[PDB]
Amino acid sequence: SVTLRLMTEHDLAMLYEWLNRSHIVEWWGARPTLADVQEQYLPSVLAQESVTPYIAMLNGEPIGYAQSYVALGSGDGWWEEETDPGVRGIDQLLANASQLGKGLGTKLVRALVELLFNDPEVTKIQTDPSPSNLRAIRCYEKAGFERQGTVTTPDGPAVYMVQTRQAFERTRS
C-alpha cells in the first residue's frame, strides 16, 4: 500500500536527484539545479502559491513526490476561470523508472484523492496532464478521474480531468 507524508526541507536533496532522472525530465513541468530545487520546492515557498508537497511511501521507502494545490489560489494565468475555493488540483511522479507501469501511480493518486476529500471544504479534484502524456491520463482515469476537455494553461494545452466528491462517495465502497 502507498501512503503519503508531508515533504520536509530534509527531502529536497533527494527530490533534486529525482527531478533530474530522464523518465521525470521528459514529463515534469526541465533539469533543475540543487539551488533551483531548494528555492522552488521548499514547503514554505510552495505554501505561498497554495501548494502542499508530499512524499509517497511504500514499505518504509520513499517512492515518489506529489503536490496538491488550491486552484483559486494559483499564480497569474493559472485557473483564471475558477470561482470555487473547494477545488484542489494534483500533480505527482514516481521516483524509480523500474517501478513505472505497475499500478503504483494509481495507488498514489487514490491515496492523495482520499486525503484531499478529508478536508470537508473540498468539493472536487482536478488534474491537467498534457495531451501527449497518455500514460498519466490513463492513470488518472484508473484512479477515478474523468476527462472533461481541452484547456489552455500557461504551460500549454492540457486534458482537464476531474473527480467530484459525489463520485468519490459512490466509488469508495
**Interface residue list for ligand COA (CB under 6 A):** 23-24, 27-28, 91-94, 100-106, 129, 133-136, 138-139, 142
Question: Among candidates 158, 134, 162, which has minimal Cα distance to 148?
Answer: 162
Whole-number CA gyration radius for the chain: 15
Of the pair 106, 153, the CB lying nearest ligand COA is at: 106
Of the pair 58, 85, the CB lying nearest ligand COA is at: 58
Contact 56, 108 (CB under 8 A): yes
How far apart are CB 21 and ligand COA at their closest, in Å?
Answer: 9
Of the pair 151, 166, the CB lying nearest ligand COA is at: 151
Of the pair 138, 147, the CB lying nearest ligand COA is at: 138
How far apart are CB 102 and ligand COA at their closest, in Å?
Answer: 5
Determine if residue 16 is labeled as part of a ligand binding site: no
How far apart are CB 151 and ligand COA at their closest, in Å?
Answer: 13
User: For the residues of 115-172, what is the DSSP string, one character each?
Assistant: HHHTSTT--EEEE---TT-HHHHHHHHHTT-EEEEEEEETTEEEEEEEEEHHHHHHH-
Determine if residue 96 is labeled as part of a ligand binding site: no
**Residue 75, H or E segment:** none
Determine if residue 101 is labeled as part of a ligand binding site: yes
Determine if residue 138 is labeled as part of a ligand binding site: yes
**Residue 73, H or E segment:** none
Of the pair 87, 109, the CB lying nearest ligand COA is at: 109
Contact 143, 112 (CB under 8 A): no
How far apart are CB 3 and ligand COA at their closest, in Å?
Answer: 15
Beta-carbon contacts of residue 81 (< 8 Å; ≥ 6 apart): none
Q: Give the residue numbers of the binding site.
A: 94, 101, 103, 105-106, 133, 138, 140, 142
Q: Give the residue numbers of the binding site for CoA.
A: 94, 101, 103, 105-106, 133, 138, 140, 142
